[model samples]
Target chain A: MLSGLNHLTLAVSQLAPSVAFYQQLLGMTLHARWDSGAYLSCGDLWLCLSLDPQRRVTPPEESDYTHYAFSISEADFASFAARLEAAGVAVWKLNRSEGASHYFLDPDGHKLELHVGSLAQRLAACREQPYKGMVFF
Target chain B: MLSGLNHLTLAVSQLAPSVAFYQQLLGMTLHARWDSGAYLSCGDLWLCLSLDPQRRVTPPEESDYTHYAFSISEADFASFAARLEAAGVAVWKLNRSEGASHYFLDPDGHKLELHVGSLAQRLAACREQPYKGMVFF
Candidate 1:
């Protein structure tokens, strides 16, 4: 029914810091900005930061596991981690699954990950060492 | 720094219901299913439902407005809405923005939207009636 992801609107407690975190730290291209919201682009992905005074700000526990993963080149992974490290951003989880993945947090406590490979590669890896009762389509 | 969204892992308090919801209701393909998580694909988008005992299940408030929107064809819009209605899925918000959009909630209270246009088209519409202090890149 649906084609692909059109956009992701993330709730932010405040606009200013969240905007800087995305635009400056993440290096996403700012497409538009308003008093209550801002639109940024990560490649072809459109991202919106919406102002929400009551938005969730607490960091997720290690067990929570919900996160967004962004694709990055293996060459840029170290530099990207360095950028996050220099800014004192906490890594949420160590890479335990497939590929080179670094899980971290946004200013608003949204868990995010940067990965160095495609899902096809991950799916292939799963075949070699399958999880208990794991089945592939 | 990142190319695009590689995948989104959503915290699902229960995997069975979440798996069924994404696979059946939304018609996403089941790529893999394991003990604590399941991977589904909607077009090229990879989505994972990660089991979490303390995952948020409460539906977001209207003001919260955080959501992931998937692009759908204009021809499929009405039929998709009907299918959602038939399944008793609640409509979270009415359309007020560019394109034909339908906001709804998943079984785990994650907000989702189905949009019928691209960001380029939405940006073009925004030019005619811009939001307060809105500026394009």
Candidate 2:
């Protein structure tokens, strides 16, 4: 049998910059640090970042940027976006699903989506009834 | 600011089998299940297994298997290893720094590396001096 996901690891070019970015952006605490990299935590799970000294990295073909999405709550989402904008980080596309979401990039130029809240009911309604020109991926 | 990691996702072939495996192995609760995929939680973070309805799914290139590693406690690793051996899952190798880690292939052949503790020092040891015999990809 399989177990639940433990943590998501990103192969990084440098640790210091990546740690700084996530720490400042998401308030992730440096739970553990090592010579190769550091372990950052946000709540129960952790973000284990590994340093790739070999420098073999590339972009995921379909994704414009080389990052993945992490969700938040609607209220926390708003506050986080405000903090980023205040800190002069480019904020893009304030869209709402079950909650509100915005896109940003990490130091490695990986695009990330931070979704807040949930709009499950709204989606259910659309699915039951009908919609045009709306495709969700 | 980033709040926390909500969910981590993988495009998997057999959704049911993957779900079964993770639930039995990690004791993770099923958070959400939809027609598109099923989302399970490791703590609060979600690891989604997206399904392909038509059965026309191609395995991602080597790059798509970009890995994520979690920091497992020494105590937890002991129980985990025992469980793996009991379940007949292959036990690969054991290292002091990173603890006992082995390659586990998901139902769809997604190579996963589960390690206990941190091998920071061991990884650091090979920094300046490349160990030719040490297998690293």
Candidate 3:
């Protein structure tokens, strides 16, 4: 059985902007880097960024249900959103009964979310009222 | 700063087969299911499967560098490979100087890696020889 996520690798158009986004904006430490790719750490998970000029899908749109959500402290959530906005990253908010989430796109158009709740909280929230694009079982 | 990975949402062509692969083969616990997607858990990280018939990227090939790698205990590495083989999953080996990894594709051609170590171990392993497709900082 899989224990937990080791890393999630994403294809970026260029490595430099991706590296700057993760390292400068997100504060992730670059563990390894190459001309074609790099690995950065945020907490225990490694976010791998690789060059992919011809990625299969377009950057995630607000209408799309697919995205990665990261946990952030309630206290830091506001500041995090501000920082992202200051950097000119496009941010969208999805308000739910459980909590609100900030959706943003990476330089290459990959969608990511910063939510202020635990997985338990999310499940419970979804149980009460399903997310807009998400259908709960 | 981010705490860690809370969840990874992936696009699959079919919801049923993807759920089966994660639940039956990978031993992830299905927390919730919907017509278009499902949510499963492994340790603290959540794996989200969403149906995407119009996915942007094609199915994974060996040359494709985009992938997700999950952490497995060193003791369970061999048995995990056996299970993957038993289930007829395509397995590829990437021999790293620090550690070896098992790369395989999910039903939709999304590539995944099962490695026999932690992030710390991987960073250490890369210290001597850079990973094949990765460059060191």
Most accurate candidate by lDDT:
1
Which segments of model 2 are wrong by more than 4 Å?
A1-6, A54-57, A60-73, A82-96, A109-111, A118-137, B24-27, B52-96, B100-103, B108-137
lDDT ranking of the models = 1, 3, 2
Ranking by DockQ: 1, 3, 2
Model 1 TM-score relative to the real fold: 0.95
In terms of lDDT, the poorest run of 10 residues in model 2 chain B is B56-65
Q: Tell me the tens digit of each residue's lDDT in model 3 across B25-58.
A: 8888888887777888888888888877664434
Judging by TM-score, tell me the better candidate of 1 and 3. Answer: 1
Off by over 4 Å in 3: A53-57, A61-65, A92-97, A129-137, B62-64, B91-98, B131-137
Question: Candidate 2's residue-wise lDDT over A1-137, tens digit each?
Answer: 22434556666788788888777667877755666766676665457666766434433333332235666765576787777777766544456444466776565545567765433443455566534433332
Which stretches of candidate 1 lie above 4 Å from their native place? none
Sort all candidates by TM-score, best to worst.
1, 3, 2
True contacts kept of each: 0.88, 0.23, 0.64
Q: Local error of candidate 3 at B121, Å? A: 1.3
TM-score of each: 0.95, 0.61, 0.84
The local lDDT score (0 to 100) that residue A51 gets in candidate 2 is: 75
> Candidate 1's residue-wise lDDT over A1-137, tens digit each?
88888888889989999999989999998988888899888987899999888786766662366678888999999999999999999888899877899889987788899998877888899999998889888
Of 2 and 3, the candidate ranking higher by DockQ: 3
Which lDDT tens digits does candidate 2 get at residues B24-137? 675666655565566566544456666754333333343332455544555676676577667776422344334356544555555466665433444455454534433332
Which pairs of residues clash in candidate 3, taking residues 3 or more apart in a chain or in different chains? A33-B135, A34-B135, A56-B56, A56-B57, A57-B56
Top candidate when judged by TM-score against the true structure: 1
